[PDB]
């Protein structure tokens, strides 16, 4: 009469990567790293906006330059990994018998599942701090339906245009908030209302910005540059593919910028991948022997809102594998 062990199983932890997700569409990864070396966290820009040369004798149209200073946000990301000391006592003890060789391989696998835990924790903490940066400098849409509309601003912020801007905020707080709930109670116009609201967000976000360059993060089917990224939850991701219905690309994006992080990003992740942890521990075991004798596809559904082809990525799976709130 026996007791069957019907199999034994473990889960494969998925390797998330910040340059693999589409949250890095809205971030340019500079290889400079001197603003960590710089003492003050400011950088001063000599921007110069154009001007309209006016002709009537009101005032001379003097040139416009602005000496703007952008302070940099330095965030500190720290996890810890409590590792047992009798794992270290087998790590330093050279094994000879096959049972202690199996126990030493188990100790190395426990150690290499903690360095991998640290690297997998600093590629989730990186996405978490980046997403919390993009949620700290994200004013709500009921403010920037009008503050990003120039037909109300640029006449001079007096008391009257601000007193009307607050009363205009209070309208978009009521008749425009929870737009995917009004689209469920809408009639046959499901798609055009949601497309109008998403295009209004893309229009209110996109303005003037310093430090521009090449068309980064193109898609693969259309070849169009990707304007932004819609970080959504998974239920809203399901709802924006039955309302919008389709995707411009088959969840493929083609960034050739991910070319210096296929080298600098791999020689940390694959340097703790148990092929190098076991190798360096065999190297130190040989020292203990020496001692007494002496581009790519990015999975991101791309939707087309007018002329910009933005991406829609949900990091809900990234946070549900932590049992951490999104």
């Amino acid at each position: 009469k026996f007791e069957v062990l019907l199999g034994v199983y473990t889960n494969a932890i998925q390797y998330v990567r910040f340059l693999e997700t589409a949250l890095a569409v809205s971030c340019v990864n500079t290889e400079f790293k001197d603003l960590s070396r710089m003492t003050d966290g400011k950088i001063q820009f000599r921007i110069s906006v154009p001007t309209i040369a006016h002709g009537d004798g009101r005032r001379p149209s003097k040139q416009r330059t602005f000496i703007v200073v952008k302070n940099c946000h330095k965030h500190h990301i720290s996890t810890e990994m409590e590792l047992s000391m009798l794992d270290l006592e087998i790590l330093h003890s050279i094994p000879e018998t096959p049972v202690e060789y199996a126990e030493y391989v188990g100790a190395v696998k426990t150690v290499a599942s903690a360095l991998q835990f640290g690297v997998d924790a600093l590629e989730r903490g990186l996405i978490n701090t980046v997403l919390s940066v993009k949620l700290r400098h994200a004013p709500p849409m009921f403010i920037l339906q009008t503050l990003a509309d120039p037909t109300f601003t640029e006449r001079g912020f007096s008391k009257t245009v601000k007193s009307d801007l607050i009363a205009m905020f209070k309208r978009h707080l009521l008749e425009h908030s929870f737009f995917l709930d009004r689209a469920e109670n809408m009639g046959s116009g499901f798609s055009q209302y949601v497309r109008s609201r998403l295009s209004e967000m893309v229009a209110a976000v996109s303005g003037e910005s310093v430090l521009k360059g090449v068309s980064t993060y193109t898609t693969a089917k259309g070849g169009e540059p990707v304007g932004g990224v819609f970080i959504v939850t998974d239920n809203v991701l399901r709802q924006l593919l039955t309302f919008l219905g389709e995707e411009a690309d088959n969840q493929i994006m083609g960034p050739s910028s991910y070319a210096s992080f296929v080298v600098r990003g791999e020689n940390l992740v694959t340097a703790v991948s148990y092929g190098r942890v076991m190798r360096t521990f065999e190297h130190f075991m040989a020292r203990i022997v020496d001692s007494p004798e002496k581009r790519v596809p990015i999975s991101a559904a791309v939707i087309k809102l007018g002329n910009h082809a933005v991406a829609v990525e949900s990091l809900q799976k990234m946070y549900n594998d932590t049992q951490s709130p999104y």
């Binding site: 500079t30 290889e31 400079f32 310093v210 430090l211 521009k212 360059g213």
Partner: peptide, 18 residues
């Protein structure tokens, strides 16, 4: 010039630069 400010500002000299 004694640093690596090529990718930070951009490639074009009329838009951005040092």
């Amino acid at each position: 010039l004694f640093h690596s400010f090529d990718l930070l500002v951009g490639k074009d000299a009329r838009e951005a630069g040092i």
